Design a protein around this ligand. Sequence first.
Ligand SMILES: CC(C)[C@H](C(=O)O)[C@@H](O)C(=O)O
Ligand SMILES: CC(C)[C@H](C(=O)O)[C@@H](O)C(=O)O
Ligand SMILES: [Cl-]
Ligand SMILES: [Cl-]
Ligand SMILES: [Mg+2]
Ligand SMILES: [Mg+2]
Lengths: 369, 368
Amino acid sequence: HHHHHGSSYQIAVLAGDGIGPEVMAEARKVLAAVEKRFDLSIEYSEYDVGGAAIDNHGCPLPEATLKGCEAADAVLFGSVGGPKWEHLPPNDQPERGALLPLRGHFELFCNMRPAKLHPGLEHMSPLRSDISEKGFDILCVRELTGGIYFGKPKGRQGEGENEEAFDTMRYSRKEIRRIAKIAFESAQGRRKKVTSVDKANVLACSVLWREVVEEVAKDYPDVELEHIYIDNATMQLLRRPNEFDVMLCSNLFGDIVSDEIAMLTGSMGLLASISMNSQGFGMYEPAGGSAPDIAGQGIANPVAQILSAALLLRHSLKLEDAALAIEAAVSKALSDGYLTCELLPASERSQAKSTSQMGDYIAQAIAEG
Amino acid sequence: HHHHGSSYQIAVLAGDGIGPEVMAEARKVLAAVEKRFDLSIEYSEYDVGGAAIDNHGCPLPEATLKGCEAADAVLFGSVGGPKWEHLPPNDQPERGALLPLRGHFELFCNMRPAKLHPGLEHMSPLRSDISEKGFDILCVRELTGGIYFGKPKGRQGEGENEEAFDTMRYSRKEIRRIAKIAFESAQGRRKKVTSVDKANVLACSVLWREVVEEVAKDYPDVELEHIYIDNATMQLLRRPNEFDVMLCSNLFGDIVSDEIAMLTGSMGLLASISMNSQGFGMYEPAGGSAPDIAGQGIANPVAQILSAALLLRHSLKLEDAALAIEAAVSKALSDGYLTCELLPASERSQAKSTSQMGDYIAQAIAEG
Ligand SMILES: CC(C)[C@H](C(=O)O)[C@@H](O)C(=O)O
Ligand SMILES: CC(C)[C@H](C(=O)O)[C@@H](O)C(=O)O
Ligand SMILES: [Cl-]
Ligand SMILES: [Cl-]
Ligand SMILES: [Mg+2]
Ligand SMILES: [Mg+2]
């Protein structure tokens, strides 16, 4: 879809399952405030995805939803999955079923998961206090359309005790180069360090990864490159998270490293995910899941979904001041002690703010300019 | 080679860096144990790793491979160092010794026991309210299948379409043999197995989870749960006391064991068992060759010493001898015999040397 100057921007809204819809409502409330403020013309089109789409259409990614994403500038996505549908066959489940085909179809090779310890919440981290007091801010860049996720041969053959399954990890120089360039450009604008995570002592793919990373590293002389094996990286993120800036990982290794870093913040309800292609189209979603055990109770933390909209404004729509406004309003809520239940002790449950109290505060803070 | 009623044969492969100095403490402890229990053991020493490169021109000399073939078990140190890290990859110590050993000897079973020792919970990089509760997690890693040894591997093409590939493969036989060991291990511990996979993405993990469900029916007293690798990395942070045995494929077990080792904050205490179906195995510290402290007499020998205890239990079936070493090491750690790295720098004068630790532990076994 190409945007024309003065036309409305088009956002496909795919709220999904569980807490998706209730936090999406708060992202739409904060977006309405931003639209009025910075003067925007945005149109929204809602589509089912995930378990909601299994329930309404019989599959997790209906053709009408694919077509609706194709017509938009950007997708604001909630979360999918839940026990209702985990009995289902594999290709048929909400997450495998919606997320892998979305990524493949739109060539969303670039995943970026920003995580940091926010001022005054260092204590909720599961790290020892002398480590969490040091802070960290780590951007994970993960290659999303290659490696072992999409490689073939992939399947199962044979019989008796010798029946075997197989998966193939594959990477080309073109695929490694595009993802490495995003990690180095990111690092150039942050603290100028890329840690590339591989298993180059075992995997041919990682020997090639490390070679092509070294090639691209030549074009970014201001940025320090280091390499680390995936097993050692899980250890070093525990011991010295303040020493990393941008992580650059393959598809499986980035799946792992981004989750470990997310849990090290102790505040996953704050975390957002960007999945983009080379034309600037992307989907923007909370890193955490559909949390079906609390769906509908108004207790979910909507900051991850709100931040997802800020990153959509910045990355796809290039509406930079609109994005920073959201981010400032979120930070003002968190420092003015507007916290949801999972960011307070169990004894302070009655000071917790609801999903809608949080969105109200953040939307009001946007209007205050 | 099998054991007949005669002397046991151990092959000693000390390797590089701190390998020799902590092997010396392990040999001291073994001498005490052979005296107290009247054991009959013969030892043979072989170069491996960079020592082997420097002396023989390759990291796993044919003499070293044969010396292991002739033994009931191997006591292994560590290999690697910056002197050798510039060489072509197959010529380097680790890749060139460990992967050929594992493949040659069919060491499909890797076991890495990890726990917070009493009084050292504060070493963990976890928040105190988590670490103070303790944990003890045994990682069972499948060691000779999956993407480590799968074929094909290599490259195709040229320029932008130069591409590389690796293949993860697993048969039912390979999943069932390593699942059994996790279930037997759990039955002797806290009766829970957590199988770590990525069954929403990998065909090998769909077959892993099916074969693990089959094997679990034979151990109805053990709780089975499945967890995806990315989530397992987060749940081991928040609730490590809730896990007993982890059951993992080769790459997933390489990653999960390393995260758990760092959750202890005391990697100098940790040992690794690599065994085959015949009970032959190689027993070694989980930690590396630490060349920047080699020869200083600062290295912690507990992981090497505990490697010799596990060799006695798993390969030699000498349970009382194994338990003796474990009791002596626990005595040392609770009686203020701790090395450099287990104490604040401010308390360095209270730290024990490599040989002071061996002496004390050997002295303690010499006391019934
Ligand atoms: C649901 C699953 C296929 C997915 C992945 O592995 O990428 C998820 O873990 C994620 O990280 O977004
Ligand atoms: C050196 C490397 C090949 C090896 C492996 O990946 O298994 C190491 O990380 C280990 O855990 O023993
Ligand atoms: Cl991958
Ligand atoms: Cl594997
Ligand atoms: Mg994931
Ligand atoms: Mg490892």
